[PDB]
Amino acid sequence: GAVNRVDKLVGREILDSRGNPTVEVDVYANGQKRPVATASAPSGASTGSNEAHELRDGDKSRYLGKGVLKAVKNVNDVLGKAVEGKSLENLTELDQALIDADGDELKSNLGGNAITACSFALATAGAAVRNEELFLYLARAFHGADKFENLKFRLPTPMVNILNGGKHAGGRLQIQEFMILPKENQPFREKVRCVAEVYQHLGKILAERAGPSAKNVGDEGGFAPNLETADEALNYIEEAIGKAGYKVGEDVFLALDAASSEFYNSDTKKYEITQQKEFLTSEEMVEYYVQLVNRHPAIISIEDGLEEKDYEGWKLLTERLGSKIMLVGDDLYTTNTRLIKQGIEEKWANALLLKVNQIGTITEAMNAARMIFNVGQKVIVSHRSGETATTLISDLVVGIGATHIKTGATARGERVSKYNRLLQIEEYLEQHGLLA
Ligand SMILES: O=C(O)[C@@H](CO)OP(=O)(O)O
Ligand code: NA
Ligand code: NA
């Protein structure tokens, strides 16, 4: 048609925010000599067996085996050719062409990282050549033209990592992530300011307790002091909330990502909730969370509180706390529609952490979110531990109408750029009268 069609894709090995290679894709379109868009894939700290296969070179002489030249070559030689001449206005067809080209359930022929990077860049290109905001382009793809026409938009509530334990830190605290959430009913610019101020105060509090090194940050910008218990962590966070001038349980709420698979022993069936000290059954773990919420009633969400296949544990956790708090499946689901269907039917949990690159394309990720939306459960659009300059998940969370984003502390460029993109979106929505 020559109007808004793909001329070619060009792949490139770049560095992600952890300094490891990842795939970046340029899209050429409309006969234009310079790319109309560029986006890149994120990367988690680990990739398992129910997720899109992240294709790495394994050449120990480059990037300690983590190069992505093979995946990049698949962009240039296969995936590019599969979308050449196709319209940038139909994201579903573009994503299906990528899926079909690879032809493997786990995307292990061409590489999930190549496919996600192409999906991101092609969606970014489609919005660019239509001279429209990316979240609008994604909203139209998610809802269809008829529901999109008069659609209004909401900004998410951010779940903001500010303190880390587990594998991240040197203490015996095993819960991996402690987050703050600002109250829902206020402008997004005030949500951002609130969590940024709490984050600054926590850093100063920790630097007073332990000196300058205590303000060094982990991969997602959170602090990693040496702590023993979740109560210690939550008490520091509550202190920072107060120093910022906010009220715990009114202005600022708390959330956990236990990453509990990391401290579960499947032979003993015990959770090592305090390193080399305390070992709990599934049932005792649920009771532990119940009492932690009693002591800290501002806790409104717990992610991966039980191990990824401890389905009897999850059923009970959701039985006992599901009416009060979000129970977020991350490892529980790995953005996998087979698991999501089973978890909805069996009532494992009541929310999904959505990682597009775990499933592959944006379209595949939208179907997963739809299943959750369809039963009144919550979608939290998530970063990965290795992020890039692409801010697409900010446009995605608004475009699909999900209530929450989880994209790091208010520090490090690959985290704050997502908050800044949402600040831009909020202004655009206000200016055009699209704010719901
Ligand atoms: O566990 C998670 O929610 C994400 C980041 O917080 O981790 P990773 O990308 O390493 O899977
Ligand atoms: Na540790
Ligand atoms: Na997680």
Evaluated on CA atoms 348, 354, 360, 366, the torsion sign reads: positive
Phi, psi dihedral angles at 60 (to 5 degrees)? -65, -20
Supply the residue whose CA is at minimum distance from atom 2 of ligand 1: 384
Q: Are the CB atoms for 360 and 334 separated by under 8 Å?
A: no
Top mutation candidate among 355, 357, 393 for ligand 1, by most atoms within 8 Å of CB = 355
For residue 280, how far is its CA from the centre of ligand 2 (angstroms)? Answer: 18
Among residues 36, 25, 27, 38, the alpha carbon closest in space to that of 71 is found at: 25
133 lines ligand 1 (CB under 6 A): no
Please give the number of the atom of ligand 1 that sits closest to the Cα of 177: 6
Maximum C-alpha span of the chain: 67
Please give the number of the atom of ligand 1 that sits closest to the Cα of 161: 6
CA–CA dist 151, 399 (Å, integer): 10
Per residue, the 3-state secondary structure of the chain, as one string, reads: CCCCEEEEEEEEEEECCCCCEEEEEEEEECCCCCCCEEEECCECCCCCCCCCCCCCCCCCCCHHHCCCHHHHHHHHHHHHHHHCCCECCCHHHHHHHHHHHHCCCCCCCCCHHHHHHHHHHHHHHHHHHCCCCHHHHHHHHHHCHHHHCCCCECCCEECEEEEECHHHCCCCECCCEEEEEECCCCCHHHHHHHHHHHHHHHHHHHHHHHCHHHHCECCCCCECCCCCCHHHHHHHHHHHHHHCCCCECCCEEEEEECCHHHHEECCCCEEEEECCCEEECHHHHHHHHHHHHHHCCCEEEEECCCCCCCHHHHHHHHHHHCCCCEEEECCCCCCCHHHHHHHHHHCCCCEEEECHHHHCCHHHHHHHHHHHHCCCCEEEEECCCECCCCCHHHHHHHHCCCCEEECCCCCCHHHHHHHHHHHHHHHHHHHHCCEC
**CA–CA distances in Å: residue 115 to residues 22, 36, 37, 402:** 12, 18, 16, 23
For residue 164, how far is its CA from the centre of ligand 2 (angstroms)? Answer: 9
384 lines ligand 1 (CB under 6 A): yes
Neighbours of 194 (CB within 10 A): 24
For residue 251, how far is its CA from the centre of ligand 1 (angstroms)? Answer: 26
**Residue length of the chain:** 436
Question: In the numeric block, which tokens belong to residue 32?
Answer: 């234009």
CA–CA dist 193, 195 (Å, integer): 6
Question: How far is Cα of residue 281 from the mean position of the Cα atoms in its chain?
Answer: 29
Supply the residue whose CA is at minimum distance from atom 4 of ligand 1: 384
Top mutation candidate among 330, 358, 387 for ligand 1, by most atoms within 8 Å of CB = 330
44 lines ligand 1 (CB under 6 A): yes
**CA–CA distances in Å: residue 399 to residues 153, 234, 290, 377:** 7, 33, 35, 17
What are the residue numbers of the active site?
A: 220, 355
Resolution in units of Å: 2.0
Question: In the numeric block, which tokens belong to residue 291?
Answer: 């009492």
304 lines ligand 1 (CB under 6 A): no
For residue 150, how far is its CA from the centre of ligand 1 (angstroms)? Answer: 35
Evaluated on CA atoms 40, 144, 350, 182, the torsion sign reads: positive
CA–CA dist 82, 79 (Å, integer): 5
Evaluated on CA atoms 58, 62, 68, 69, the torsion sign reads: negative
* Residues 6 or more apart whose Cβ sits within 8 Å of residue 189: 423, 426
What's the CA angle centered on 289, arms 286 and 293, to 5 degrees? 145
For residue 396, how far is its CA from the centre of ligand 1 (angstroms)? Answer: 18
Question: In the numeric block, which tokens belong to residue 219?
Answer: 């991969």
Residue 348, phi-psi category: left (phi > 0), alpha (psi -120 to 50), beta (remainder)? alpha
Q: Are the CB atoms for 94 and 88 separated by under 8 Å?
A: yes
Q: What residue spans define the domains of the chain?
A: 5-131, 132-436
Question: In the numeric block, which tokens belong to residue 114?
Answer: 């190549």
Q: How was this structure obtained?
A: X-ray
